[PDB]
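Contributing new complexes? Match this layout with magnesium ion.
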Amino acid sequence: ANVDEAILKRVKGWAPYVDAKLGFRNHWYPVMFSKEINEGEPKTLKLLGENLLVNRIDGKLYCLKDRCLHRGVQLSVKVECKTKSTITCWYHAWTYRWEDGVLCDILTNPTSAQIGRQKLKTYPVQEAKGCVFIYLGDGDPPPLARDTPPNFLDDDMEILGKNQIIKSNWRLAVENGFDPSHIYIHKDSILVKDNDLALPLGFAPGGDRKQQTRVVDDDVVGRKGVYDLIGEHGVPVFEGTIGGEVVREGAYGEKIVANDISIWLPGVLKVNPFPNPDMMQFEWYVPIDENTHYYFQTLGKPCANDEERKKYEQEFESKWKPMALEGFNNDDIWAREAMVDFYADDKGWVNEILFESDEAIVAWRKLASEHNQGIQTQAHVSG
Amino acid sequence: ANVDEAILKRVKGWAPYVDAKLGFRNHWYPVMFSKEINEGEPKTLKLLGENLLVNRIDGKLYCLKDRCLHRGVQLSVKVECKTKSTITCWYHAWTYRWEDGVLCDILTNPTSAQIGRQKLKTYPVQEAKGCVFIYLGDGDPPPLARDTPPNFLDDDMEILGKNQIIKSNWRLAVENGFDPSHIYIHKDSILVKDNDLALPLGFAPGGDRKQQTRVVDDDVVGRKGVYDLIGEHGVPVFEGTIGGEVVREGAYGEKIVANDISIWLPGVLKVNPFPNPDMMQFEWYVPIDENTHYYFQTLGKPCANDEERKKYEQEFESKWKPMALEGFNNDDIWAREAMVDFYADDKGWVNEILFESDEAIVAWRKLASEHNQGIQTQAHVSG
Amino acid sequence: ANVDEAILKRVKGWAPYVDAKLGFRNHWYPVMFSKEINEGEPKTLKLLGENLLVNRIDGKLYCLKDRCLHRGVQLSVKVECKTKSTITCWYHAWTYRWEDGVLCDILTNPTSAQIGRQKLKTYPVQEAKGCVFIYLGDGDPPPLARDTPPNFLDDDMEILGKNQIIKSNWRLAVENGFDPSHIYIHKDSILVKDNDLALPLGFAPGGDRKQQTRVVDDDVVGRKGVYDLIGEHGVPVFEGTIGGEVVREGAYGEKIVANDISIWLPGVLKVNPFPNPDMMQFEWYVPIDENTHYYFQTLGKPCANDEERKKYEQEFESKWKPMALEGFNNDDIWAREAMVDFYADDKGWVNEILFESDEAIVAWRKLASEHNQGIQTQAHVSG
Ligand code: FES
Ligand code: FES
Ligand code: FES
Ligand SMILES: [Fe+2]
Ligand SMILES: [Fe+2]
Ligand SMILES: [Fe+2]
Ligand SMILES: [Mg+2]
Ligand SMILES: [Mg+2]
Ligand SMILES: [Mg+2]
Ligand SMILES: [Mg+2]
Ligand SMILES: [Mg+2]
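Output block (do not edit by hand):
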């Protein structure tokens, strides 16, 4: 639906994934933090190519398509919320209920035949762990757990994070996250030095192809993902050689991190533990449009009470956000940006030359192709 | 030519209008004020996607296509008018007569077989009320009055105006101008408050007078237009309601304006009276290219002598230009800009949901489709 | 390959040239001066649409495609030359030999089956006369002499020059260089005024079409070019007339230059003598992409020894660079930029109206169509 059929015929291992330039419809995605949306302060964002409005009304979140039914303007150009329960388009005052999107009033013509006979698209919205998730899909949503990595929703897991807009397609971000050999780019990170991490340059893979990953397609809340098992039977590379000479060494530190690495539909990485042995990292790559993603980064730590939560918040602000979320992952940002040109014409999916550690990436591409809940298309965006 | 047949086949009754992305050929259009084009000082502009040169020679205006026949450069890159009657291309000195476009000389090769056997396109130009009009069409032009609204050319009518380039397609500007319900956007205007205008939020169409428009096809100079009668025959909304609760009032005021509102081919609105009881507003939305128009605004006031003309100019500079042309119509500008996205892929023409007051807009779309004098195409532009 | 088949059918005689939007493959092209690339300091550039890296190692130049075989990143985003003889991709440390492009190591997986089984594209590089030439083509190259004008490689010919990036297609540059009538644009040049040049406004051609040029398809080293002979039979125009009135004169200077003007594949102009009677100008119009070229200008003067070399370097800096390479050719730069719009859609090749002096340009388009060593296509650029 999105890519030249002639390219899709050349990527038969994972053609639906290559078609999914706008992401997968009918999944939950995080778009902002709960603390960023105040009572009665609607916010605009673009998700899977669609402009949306989110509002908090008596503490509850609601999501309306930011596109008037009448002349297709963004209501957000000039927000008019004239009652708690409604928003009025600024142009001809078509008025919609947040709760169900029904056209309930038109201020410029209270006799219109359109009143009560039209509905603006709404999307389900849930807050969990101080994160705002939108179900960009149609019909009854699944539990949020389906589209979140294991442990993210644990009662005692405290989540703190950072969000920003990155100019690469979401898939280049997912693959960069889940790529076992990309950790070469992190060899000079401040985090690796100041937090004393064991970080190899890469891994010489051991065992058979089928042992390099574990597909999870039998999780009982319907979660679908892949674990990277390259470190299980693989030999970590700490001495980089050219023609047999050592030219580079890996990070010779004491702290073992990233024993468990997994990627989940719709596009969320879990790294456990990271960036410290007592915490884990969960990061989403949320499709905004064909060219752009939200890099929605979270660190989780079990905290038993308000005192542990406060101690974690203080370490997050003082150490883990600047050292790890910024000082380690900033190199991922320009890596993603560097892949844009090759994949921009959809040709890089045919012309890439993969090697052994990309087994993790190919397993993800297949999992995503088989288990996605729909391919978002320009028809969903416009129609 | 300009729009996919898949869209046009879905808009029967006004498909020519939807195809007319670049405007209608074979009409007059205003492009600048007389004072902006000085004797022997050529000016460049783009009209209906064509680059044009205008010059004043012995007081009279001429217009050549700003594209050399030879290698297709704009002559205006380096203007060389070496005699009163001619322009010489800067590149190889092909020399054209302003009066008829004829290639009369080539300075680089006075023996060329091209001399006297080629002609650069010319367009008629006329000045009226201090406004420069170009006939962007072929063959001998109709009278200017065919393409101007009633009274604009009246002997006593003093015209003052403002012109600027706006980044929307021309049709979004025309529809914004003629839209009976869009007056909702003007509810907070300083003009409405300070000049004591009566301005409803909108109109409930009137049950005792069923015809919401009057087509003028029967005019004496052949002008073609539509009068909006909703406001004359409708029930004005001064108390806008949501769930039956008043959430917004209209503007009460002594001064009744816009008794008669009409749109005319090729795309010029007349509002009478406006912004004061003895004035009229005439505004054009002149196509520059697919994405851009001139918003050519004028205010007319009958003036018997130089003292009345002087008083009107003072009034215009101190009050009407800042309060009305800027203050009031600035909200029309961002309204037009806000419609761009929905119409940019041509899908808005199919996906819009109209309501009752849009009968005025559909009447215009059908009038324009029936009585335009030609659809401008890329073949006219490049060629 | 590059242009709508419809257009190519309307230009039959020179269709391969109209197709050659990215330039001709399997030719040498200058891209920088020798003194701009230091030992072990790689430089990036784009040539015929391909991103390339050039390095100097033990004084010798090497050229690798700047696109990793693995995920298609530019290695130049973060250059890692970890041994004298190699470059390591910053992403997964795929390590390539400069000499033959062979993938000789991967630091992230020294056990990979890809090692020794892949090679990055390399291009030959040759330095001559202080200029860096890349053979943008396949297989063992021809002698550089084939792709340089006569006398450029003469033992005693001292070359000095200037390079810059210009926003036009390379062919608009070539035609502007070789066009006999375009000298009209140079009539006010500081070089003409200050160096007392004789410069007509143009020529009235004499003799047959065949007599207006001399095709060199028969040169001993395989050079392919056209001499402009318009001034052999041609009558110089020094009095430009409109309606038989003189409106402009040529330059009546004592100094005679540009006796011999020739254009050579792959797109290099030779003007002898210029800008003074014992110097030659050799200038290349090197394709960067569809929209861009290097304007690689050089001035040659024969010098017997180190002392003549130094005097020429001084007059180049104080006189010839500013007065000629800038004061004369700057008008050529904006002339090229002015042709972009008409040729951007490929329609100008069909819609232009040529005149008699364009027989030089037609002879070049025919020579280029017949004798080019290959049409660069998006398949070469992409894969
Ligand atoms: S575009 Fe929203 S009410 Fe008209
Ligand atoms: S482009 Fe105008 S005379 Fe050649
Ligand atoms: S992209 Fe260069 S080594 Fe992976
Ligand atoms: Fe990373
Ligand atoms: Fe308005
Ligand atoms: Fe020149
Ligand atoms: Mg709801
Ligand atoms: Mg005329
Ligand atoms: Mg009032
Ligand atoms: Mg008055
Ligand atoms: Mg080599």
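Reviewers usually confirm one structural detail per submission. For this one: Chain A is about 20% helix and 30% strand.
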